[PDB]
Structures are given as C-alpha cells and as structure tokens.
Amino acid sequence: MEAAHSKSTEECLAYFGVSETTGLTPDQVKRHLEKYGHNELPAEEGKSLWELVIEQFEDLLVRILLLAACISFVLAWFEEGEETITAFVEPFVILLILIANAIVGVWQERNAENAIEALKEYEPEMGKVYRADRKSVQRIKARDIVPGDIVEVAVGDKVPADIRILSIKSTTLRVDQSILTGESVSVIKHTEPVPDPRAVNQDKKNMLFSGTNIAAGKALGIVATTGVSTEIGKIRDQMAATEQDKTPLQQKLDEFGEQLSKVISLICVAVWLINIGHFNDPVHGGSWIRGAIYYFKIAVALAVAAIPEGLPAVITTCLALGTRRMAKKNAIVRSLPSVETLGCTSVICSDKTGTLTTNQMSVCKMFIIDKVDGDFCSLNEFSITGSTYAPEGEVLKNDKPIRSGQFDGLVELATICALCNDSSLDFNETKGVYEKVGEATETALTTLVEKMNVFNTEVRNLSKVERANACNSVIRQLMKKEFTLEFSRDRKSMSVYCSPAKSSRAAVGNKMFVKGAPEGVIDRCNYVRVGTTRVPMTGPVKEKILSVIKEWGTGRDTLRCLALATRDTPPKREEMVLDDSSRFMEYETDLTFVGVVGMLDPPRKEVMGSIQLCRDAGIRVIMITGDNKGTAIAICRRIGIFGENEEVADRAYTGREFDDLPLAEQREACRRACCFARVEPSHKSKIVEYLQSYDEITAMTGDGVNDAPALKKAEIGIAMGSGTAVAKTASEMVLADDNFSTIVAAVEEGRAIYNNMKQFIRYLISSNVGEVVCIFLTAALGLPEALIPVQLLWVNLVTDGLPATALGFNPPDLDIMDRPPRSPKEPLISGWLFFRYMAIGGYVGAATVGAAAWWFMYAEDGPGVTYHQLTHFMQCTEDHPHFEGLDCEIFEAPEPMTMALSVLVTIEMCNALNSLSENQSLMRMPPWVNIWLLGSICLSMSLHFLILYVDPLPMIFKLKALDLTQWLMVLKISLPVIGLDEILKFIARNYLEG
Numbered sequence: 001m002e003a004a005h006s007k008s009t010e011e012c013l014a015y016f017g018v019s020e021t022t023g024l025t026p027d028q029v030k031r032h033l034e035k036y037g038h039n040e041l042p043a044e045e046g047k048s049l050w051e052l053v054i055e056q057f058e059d060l061l062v063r064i065l066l067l068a069a070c071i072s073f074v075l076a077w078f079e080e081g082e083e084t085i086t087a088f089v090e091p092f093v094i095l096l097i098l099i100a101n102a103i104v105g106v107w108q109e110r111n112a113e114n115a116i117e118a119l120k121e122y123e124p125e126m127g128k129v130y131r132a133d134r135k136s137v138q139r140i141k142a143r144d145i146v147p148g149d150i151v152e153v154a155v156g157d158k159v160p161a162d163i164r165i166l167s168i169k170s171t172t173l174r175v176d177q178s179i180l181t182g183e184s185v186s187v188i189k190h191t192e193p194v195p196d197p198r199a200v201n202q203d204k205k206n207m208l209f210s211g212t213n214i215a216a217g218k219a220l221g222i223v224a225t226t227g228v229s230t231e232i233g234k235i236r237d238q239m240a241a242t243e244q245d246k247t248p249l250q251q252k253l254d255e256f257g258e259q260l261s262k263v264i265s266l267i268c269v270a271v272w273l274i275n276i277g278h279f280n281d282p283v284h285g286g287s288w289i290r291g292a293i294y295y296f297k298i299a300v301a302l303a304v305a306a307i308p309e310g311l312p313a314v315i316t317t318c319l320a321l322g323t324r325r326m327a328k329k330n331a332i333v334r335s336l337p338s339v340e341t342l343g344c345t346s347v348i349c350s351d352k353t354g355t356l357t358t359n360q361m362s363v364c365k366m367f368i369i370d371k372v373d374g375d376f377c378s379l380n381e382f383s384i385t386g387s388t389y390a391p392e393g394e395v396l397k398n399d400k401p402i403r404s405g406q407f408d409g410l411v412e413l414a415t416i417c418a419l420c421n422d423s424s425l426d427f428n429e430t431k432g433v434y435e436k437v438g439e440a441t442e443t444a445l446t447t448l449v450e451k452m453n454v455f456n457t458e459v460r461n462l463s464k465v466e467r468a469n470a471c472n473s474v475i476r477q478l479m480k481k482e483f484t485l486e487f488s489r490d491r492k493s494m495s496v497y498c499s500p501a502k503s504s505r506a507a508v509g510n511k512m513f514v515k516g517a518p519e520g521v522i523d524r525c526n527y528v529r530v531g532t533t534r535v536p537m538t539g540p541v542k543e544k545i546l547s548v549i550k551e552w553g554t555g556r557d558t559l560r561c562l563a564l565a566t567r568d569t570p571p572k573r574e575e576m577v578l579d580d581s582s583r584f585m586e587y588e589t590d591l592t593f594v595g596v597v598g599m600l601d602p603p604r605k606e607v608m609g610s611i612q613l614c615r616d617a618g619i620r621v622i623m624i625t626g627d628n629k630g631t632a633i634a635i636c637r638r639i640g641i642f643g644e645n646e647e648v649a650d651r652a653y654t655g656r657e658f659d660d661l662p663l664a665e666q667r668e669a670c671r672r673a674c675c676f677a678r679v680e681p682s683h684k685s686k687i688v689e690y691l692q693s694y695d696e697i698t699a700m701t702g703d704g705v706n707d708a709p710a711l712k713k714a715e716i717g718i719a720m721g722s723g724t725a726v727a728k729t730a731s732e733m734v735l736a737d738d739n740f741s742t743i744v745a746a747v748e749e750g751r752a753i754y755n756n757m758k759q760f761i762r763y764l765i766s767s768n769v770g771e772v773v774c775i776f777l778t779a780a781l782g783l784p785e786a787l788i789p790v791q792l793l794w795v796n797l798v799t800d801g802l803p804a805t806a807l808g809f810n811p812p813d814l815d816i817m818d819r820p821p822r823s824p825k826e827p828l829i830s831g832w833l834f835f836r837y838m839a840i841g842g843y844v845g846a847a848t849v850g851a852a853a854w855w856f857m858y859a860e861d862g863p864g865v866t867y868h869q870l871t872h873f874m875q876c877t878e879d880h881p882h883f884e885g886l887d888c889e890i891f892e893a894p895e896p897m898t899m900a901l902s903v904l905v906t907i908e909m910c911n912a913l914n915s916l917s918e919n920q921s922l923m924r925m926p927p928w929v930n931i932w933l934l935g936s937i938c939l940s941m942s943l944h945f946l947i948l949y950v951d952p953l954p955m956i957f958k959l960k961a962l963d964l965t966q967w968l969m970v971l972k973i974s975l976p977v978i979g980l981d982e983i984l985k986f987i988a989r990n991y992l993e994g
C-alpha cells in the first residue's frame with residue numbers, strides 16, 4: 001500500500017478492507033504473506049572461501065606468470081640426465097610466489113563484517129497484532145506481519161514494519177527516528193493526513209518506520225509495507241547495490257598490466273620473425289624440437305623479466321605499516337588500499353549530528369527578569385559553557401564566571417529544570433563518560449542544573465557516578481513531586497505539582513512548575529517573577545520577552561528555547577482530574593513567568609580548526625544532515641563552513657529544494673553548496689555520486705544508520721568511534737577517538753605514503769624495463785642468455801625488494817598539506833620521466849648483456865674471444881670444425897651470467913639511490929637522508945654475496961664468484977648509472993621544466 005502518509009486513516013482501512021477493532025483474518029494473512037512475502041530483509045552473504053581463491057588468479061599478470069610457471073614446469077620436467085634436481089626450482093619459485101600472494105590476498109578480504117547484518121539488528125524478533133480470530137493482542141514473529149495488519153506499538157518497542165498510525169492511545173506518541181534522520185529527538189506523531197506527495201520522512205508525522213523505536217506512548221496503526229519495501233529496506237538495498245571501485249592506484253596498476261601483456265606479446269612475435277631466417281635454413285642439426293625449447297625459454301624469461309613479482313609484497317608491507325601508524329593516531333583502517341585513496345581526497349562530505357557536533361544537547365544561554373518598570377523590562381542573561389552531558393562547565397555573566405545561587409530567579413529556574421523533568425544523567429563506568437537517561441532536551445536541563453549548583457553543594461569529592469545527579473538530588477530534598485501533567489500537543493507544555501518537603505523552612509504552599517514552547521506558556525502567564533517578588537504581565541513586557549526568545553530561536557543562535565514558569569497558587573489536588581489531558585491547559589493558567597533556557601547540539605571543539613586545515617590542503621567540506629536547515633546553516637557558521645554574515649541562498653538546500661533543481665543544476669549545486677539539510681539517506685549517496693561524477697575523490701564521514709549508503713558510495717567512508725555499528729561496518733576507516741582532526745592527520749599520512757609508494761613503484765617497474773631489454777638484446781643477436789628466470793626472480797623479489805621497501809620510508813616533504821590534492825588520473829610515469837626510464841632501461845640491458853660479452857671475449861678467463869662465433873654458439877655442436885680451441889659447453893659458463901647479474905644488481909642499487917628524489921641530485925639530497933635505504937642496500941648486497949659464496953646456492957642460481965678484477969669491471973660498468981641519472985635530473989631541473 002503506497003502513499004499511506006497522504007491517505008486518511010479511513011482510506012487506509014478501506015484500502016485493505018479491515019476494521020481497526022478486528023484486523024485481518026488468518027486466511028487474509030496467509031494470502032498477504034504469499035503476495036507480499038515475509039516482513040524481513042534478505043541477508044547479503046556470498047563469497048565462499050573457494051571463490052576468494054579463484055579471484056586471486058584472475059589478474060592478468062598473475063595468469064601470465066602462472067602460464068610461464070607451467071611452461072617452465074613442462075620444460076624443467078622433460079630434461080636430460082644432467083641435473084634434474086635443481087631444474088624445478090624455477091617453476092616452484094614462480095608457483096610459490098603466486099601461491100604466497102594469493103593466500104595473503106584471501107586473508108585480506110576474509111575478515112569483513114556485513115553492514116547489512118548489523119542493519120538487521122534494527123529488526124525486532126516479535127511484533128504485536130490484532131487479527132480477527134482473537135480479541136486480545138497477539139504477540140507474533142515480526143517476519144509474519146503483513147500489509148494490512150492492525151499493529152500495536154508501545155514504549156521501548158522497535159517498530160516492526162512501515163505503518164500508518166490510526167489511533168494514539170496515550171497522550172502523545174514519541175518516536176526516535178534517528179535511523180532515518182540521525183536525530184534522536186522525539187518526534188511527536190499525530191494521525192491526520194500529510195497531503196504533500198513528496199513528504200520526506202521528517203514530514204511524515206503520521207507514519208511509523210520499521211526499525212525506529214518508541215520513546216513513549218502507545219498507538220495502533222495499520223501496516224502499509226513490509227520487507228524491502230520500507231524505508232529501512234531502501235537503506236538495505238542501497239548498501240547491497242554498493243559496490244567498492246578499484247582505487248586510482250589499482251586502476252593504474254591494472255592498465256600497466258594490460259599494456260605489459262601487449263608489450264610481452266609483440267616482443268614474442270619479434271623473436272619469432274627475427275628467427276624466420278633460421279626457419280627454412282636451420283641446418284637440420286637441429287631444428288626438430290630444439291626450437292620449441294629455445295623459443296619457449298625466451299618466453300618464460302620475457303615474462304619473468306617484465307613483471308615486478310616483488311611489488312605486491314612491497315605494497316602490502318607498506319600499507320600494513322601505514323595502517324599501524326594510523327592506528328597510533330587513532331584512525332583504525334579496515335581497508336588497506338584506502339590508505340592511499342584518503343590522500344587524494346578532494347571533498348569531505350560530513351554528517352552533522354554526532355560527527356561535526358557532540359550529539360549532546362546543551363543549554364548555552366538562559367535568562368531571568370531583573371526588573372520591571374511598568375512598561376520597560378530588564379532581562380538578566382547568562383551563558384553556560386560545556387558541550388557534553390558531563391556536568392562540566394560554568395555559568396557566565398558578560399563572559400565571567402558567576403555563582404548562580406547569587407540570583408533568586410536562577411534558583412527558581414534550576415528548581416523548575418530539576419523537577420519538571422522525566423530524564424536524568426548517568427555515569428557509564430564501562431565507557432568512562434556521562435550519558436543521558438531519557439530525552440536529550442530534558443537531560444540538557446539536568447546537566448544545566450548540575451552546572452548551576454545553585455545551593456553551592458560540595459561536589460568536588462564525589463565519584464563521577466555520584467556526581468551525575470548530585471545538584472538535582474539536593475533540589476529533590478526541598479520539594480516533593482506529587483504528580484506530573486504530561487506534555488500534550490494542544491498546549492505544548494508540561495508541568496509538575498510539588499509540595500515543600502517536610503521541615504523545609506524555605507517555602508510554603510504547593511506549586512506547579514511549568515516548561516514548554518514559549519508562546520503558549522507566556523500567553524498563560526499573568527505575572528512575571530523578579531527575584532522573589534512578582535508583578536503583573538503587561539503587553540509591553542510580554543512583547544519584549546517574546547522578541548528576545550524569538551531572536552534566540554533564529555539567526556546565528558537558532559537555539560531550541562523553553563519558557564519556564566510557576567503557578568503560585570495551584571488548584572487544590574482534589575479539584576484536578578488527572579486522567580484527562582484535555583484539562584491540563586486550564587490547570588496551567590494564571591502562571592508566573594520565571595525564565596527561558598536555550599539549547600543546541602554543539603560543534604565538537606576541534607572541528608572548526610580541522611576544516612580550515614582541510615581548506616589549506618584544497619579539500620572542500622560539505623555538511624549533509626537529516627536535521628533542519630536553520631540548525632544546519634547555524635552550525636555551518638559556527639564551524640566556519642560559512643562566514644558569520646555570508647549569504648547562503650544558493651549554498652544551502654533541503655533535500656527537497658535540491659530535488660526541485662533540474663538534473664543539470666543538481667550536479668552544479670553539489671560543486672557550489674556546502675550545506676544540505678532535512679535529507680533522506682538516499683540524498684547523501686546521491687550527493688556523493690554527483691561529486692564523483694566530476695571525478696573527485698570523495699570521502700563521507702558520519703555515525704548513523706542513515707549515513708550508511710553514502711558511507712558505502714564514497715571512495716572513503718569514515719565512521720565515528722562512538723557511532724552506530726552500521727556506519728562503522730559500512731566504512732573504510734573509524735575515528736576511534738571521535739576526533740575530526742584525525743581525518744586531517746589521516747589525509748596527510750595518505751599523501752606521505754603515496755609519495756613514497758610511487759618511488760618504489762617507479763624503482764621496481766623501471767628495473768623490469770632494463771631486464772626485458774636484456775632478454776631481448778640477448779636473443780635478437782643470438783647470444784647465450786645473459787640472465788635466467790631464477791636470477792631475475794631473486795632480484796625482483798629480494799635484491800630490489802628490500803630497497804623498494806626502504807624507499808617506502810623516505811622522509812616526507814614538509815609542504816605536503818599545503819598542496820592541493822593530486823589528480824586521481826595522474827600517471828605514475830610520463831613525459832620526461834618516461835624517456836628517462838627508457839634511457840636507464842637501455843643502459844641496463846646493454847650493460848648486462850655487455851658484461852657477459854666482455855667475459856666471453858676481453859676477459860682473461862677467457863675462453864675466449866670469438867666474435868662471430870658467440871652469436872652462433874648453438875652451432876658448436878654440429879659445425880664444430882669452426883669452434884676450435886674451446887669446449888662445446890663454455891657457452892653455458894656461470895661467469896658470464898654472474899658478471900651480468902652483478903652488473904644488474906649494482907645498477908639496481910645505484911638506481912635505488914637515484915629513486916630517493918625524483919629531481920634532486922644526491923649532492924643536494926644525499927643517501928643518508930633515508931638511513932634504512934643504506935641499510936637495505938647493504939643487506940641486498942650481502943645477500944648477493946651469500947648466493948655467490950655459499951653452496952649449493954651458486955649451483956641453483958648458476959653463478960660463480962668473481963675476483964677483484966672482474967668486480968673492478970662490474971663497478972666501471974655499473975656506477976656510471978648514477979652519473980647518467982644525475983645529468984638527466986640536472987636537465988629536468990633546469991632547462992626542461994625549471
């Protein structure tokens with residue numbers, strides 16, 4: 001049943017054909033259960049342990065590396081009786097890595113809580129219906145409730161379905177709709193139609209929403225919709241349908257892998273065409289299958305050399321250590337990759353209540369009457385500090401602390417706030433904080449009374465538990481509450497009837513203490529209290545008082561105001577009927593006006609400063625709130641989202657106002673406006689979505705169930721530590737300390753980490769470029785492989801891996817939070833840097849394939865010198881009469897490869913130094929700038945020696961240690977790379993773009 005809020009109660013009953021004092025028949029119920037399904041949200045679930053595995057092996061490079069593993073295995077498997085024990089190390093090492101990465105990957109997504117399951121906690125097990133077969137209420141499974149059911153709800157119940165209210169049995173029905181609005185304040189429901197077809201939930205005051213809860217009262221309603229077709233079901237479906245995108249870094253790595261496979265492919269083709277010569281004229285030595293082995297071994301080397309197999313381990317270690325640092329600063333990061341993304345955030349969307357504000361209703365201003373001069377009325381106003389329910393803060397007069405007990409009017413004001421009150425305060429020993437008990441707007445009064453301490457009660461030595469209600473309790477010793485006249489909608493006030501305590505000297509005669517909306521209370525006052533005296537309420541005095549209250553309720557204050565009053569001569573108890581709320585207004589007449597309090601949900605102390613810092617880093621902050629627009633804007637001013645006197649006509653919108661914009665202009669409003677108010681959960685995700693349609697990296701911060709869809713949609717969702725479990729499980733990060741500052745620190749950490757990540761990514765991928773040149777050079781010439789997969793794997797995983805990690809700890813730039821965010825489309829390597837890496841790529845390949853040639857030739861030992869024969873060594877077998885003075889095997893000597901590996905290693909170590917800064921010479925930024933980098937190079941080098949000098953390492957790697965002369969050469973060949981890159985940095989620094 002749709003449009004329930006705009007139908008009348010009669011139309012809702014006539015729609016389902018049911019009577020409110022009978023309800024559906026059990027056969028109707030069965031029929032509805034078949035037609036509408038059960039009243040429950042489906043569970044999300046999925047992702048089997050096995051399918052986590054499968055997904056680890058769908059990555060393109062992983063496939064390519066896996067393919068090389070099997071090709072390697074097939075080759076290693078069918079080998080001669082030469083050495084068939086160290087043959088398989090190649091395949092297994094490759095397979096080991098892939099398996100290693102995978103198991104790690106699956107552990108990263110295994111532990112992931114379901115936000116939808118947390119949502120299911122707002123779903124009561126049981127509900128109450130009237131159905132036709134019984135007169136009395138039936139307690140049933142909420143999942144068996146159907147549209148058309150007559151349903152009953154009462155104080156403390158979770159609402160079981162979406163329900164049109166039919167009849168309110170108590171004096172008021174008070175509902176906490178925070179799951180839809182983020183606001184815990186009681187909504188006072190009624191049963192009249194709400195004609196606006198576009199009413200938001202906040203406007204639907206005749207509806208009860210599944211998953212909200214009744215703070216007071218009792219009512220009957222009729223179920224309009226169940227299951228997914230409810231407001232909470234829409235939150236559930238939005239979460240189900242969202243859906244985390246690859247991070248900007250992931251996308252660049254994916255694109256890299258795609259382009260890498262094309263490059264590998266084209267090169268393989270090339271090696272084939274380069275050998276189309278030895279095709280029709282291959283001697284037939286020969287040919288046979290020797291070609292398959294040869295060609296495929298080149299494929300395996302090309303694959304291995306092209307792929308930074310150490311990178312995934314390097315990135316994971318970086319992100320994991322980053323996560324630990326963040327946790328020290330109180331940002332708990334649930335998604336590793338999100339460590340990066342946070343850094344290039346360009347817009348932070350934020351919920352208000354409990355996120356930008358404390359969610360602790362606080363009385364911050366109050367006044368009483370100092371004197372009346374017939375027509376002139378002098379008010380005595382105070383302000384009160386403190387922003388939480390903690391009884392910490394002071395009462396100020398003109399910004400200086402006063403003792404409230406100095407003023408009789410304040411004594412009476414506190415008395416009313418203490419006695420006319422159904423709430424209290426509690427110190428929660430487990431959480432270490434004060435919490436409200438009952439309604440926020442009443443607990444505000446309790447807290448105010450504890451701050452005022454009008455009898456100067458000694459409180460410094462109470463435990464926090466006892467401190468919570470100490471001053472209120474003192475007032476309860478003076479006046480005994482006999483009974484309460486509860487709030488009703490007709491009069492918008494409530495009162496309590498009290499008598500002086502036995503033996504009290506401080507007063508005589510019974511009193512009613514009244515509080516409520518100012519207009520109706522003041523209209524009912526015939527007097528005004530001035531200290532201990534009272535004078536008549538005149539028109540001019542009433543007007544001055546109402547005007548000031550009106551100012552407090554609007555503009556920059558926009559406080560919620562209560563007028564406080566006393567009936568000095570109440571009716572006699574026995575002349576009052578307590579069972580008919582319709583009489584309460586008359587009982588609360590001939591009142592004496594005492595004073596007014598003004599309260600708000602205030603900004604967290606750190607927020608204004610943090611927003612400024614975000615602004616310094618080029619980051620916009622946008623408030624998106626379920627609260628009213630007047631409040632939203634006033635809070636925006638207090639925290640500096642708007643200027644105090646800024647005109648916000650097109651910078652602030654309700655969700656509805658926003659919806660009324662043409663689609664083209666909704667998008668632009670998202671770039672211009674910084675305040676959205678009175679929204680529904682789906683407005684927030686919509687705004688986030690529009691922001692993202694400008695390709696901005698968008699964060700969302702909040703604490704409520706109603707924030708969850710936006711928290712899911714944003715690239716980075718950020719939940720408050722003390723907020724709902726739903727918002728937390730929807731988030732990439734949790735602020736454990738509720739401190740908004742932490743977001744700024746997290747952004748900075750993300751920027752710092754990303755700056756280092758791209759150096760180690762630059763470092764590793766550029767080595768692969770040099771390695772591929774090597775493999776290709778040592779093929780297009782017909783030379784005996786200068787490097788083999790096992791050696792390439794050690795370098796890319798360990799030798800270069802350690803320095804890559806060290807670079808992850810380069811000192812951060814000091815101006816980091818003064819730059820605007822990086823563009824998420826920024827290439828890791830482009831332009832000058834690109835060709836620069838081509839030049840090192842060329843240098844690396846020639847230097848490596850060269851060192852080996854040097855050994856085959858100019859080296860003393862020194863087969864040696866061959867020239868034409870080196871590039872035809874596969875013919876030492878058959879055509880031997882030419883290969884004289886040398887063994888048909890000296891072309892598989894370890895020395896040449898060891899020269900080549902040592903050159904590669906030494907170059908990659910120098911290149912690790914070059915990678916400390918993109919454009920600064922080591923002369924301006926020296927190695928010791930990163931102590932752990934030097935440490936890592938010493939380690940990699942001592943590992944290189946390990947493999948050169950410790951059996952059977954050299955056998956499995958096919959290496960033979962070198963002497964001082966061979967090393968002397970390793971250095972001459974290698975060290976110039978530092979000179980090469982210093983010159984390339986030099987030009988880039990000056991001529992190019994400097």
Ligand SMILES: C/C=C(/C)C(=O)O[C@H]1C(C)=C2[C@H]([C@@H]1OC(=O)CCCCCCC)[C@@](C)(OC(C)=O)C[C@H](OC(=O)CCC)[C@@]1(O)[C@H]2OC(=O)[C@@]1(C)O
Pocket residue numbers: 252253255256257259260261263264267305306307761765766768769770772773776777827828829830833834835837838841
């Ligand atoms: C790593 C080993 C090489 C062989 C390779 O395949 O990488 C290329 C390729 C995939 C790109 C290139 C490499 O292209 C070459 O330079 C070809 C050299 C070898 C060809 C024949 C030599 C015998 C990168 C490496 O080369 C530079 C450094 O000169 C730069 C950059 O890479 C990045 O920006 C890293 C992204 C994480 C990418 O052009 C990248 O592809 C694009 O999508 C980007 C944006 O990725």
Ligand code: ALF
Pocket residue numbers: 181182183351352353354355624625626627704706707
């Ligand atoms: F706390 Al809100 F919008 F949910 F301000």
Ligand SMILES: [K+]
Pocket residue numbers: 244711712713714715716717730731732
């Ligand atoms: K998200």
Ligand SMILES: [Mg+2]
Pocket residue numbers: 182351352353354355702703704
């Ligand atoms: Mg909130």
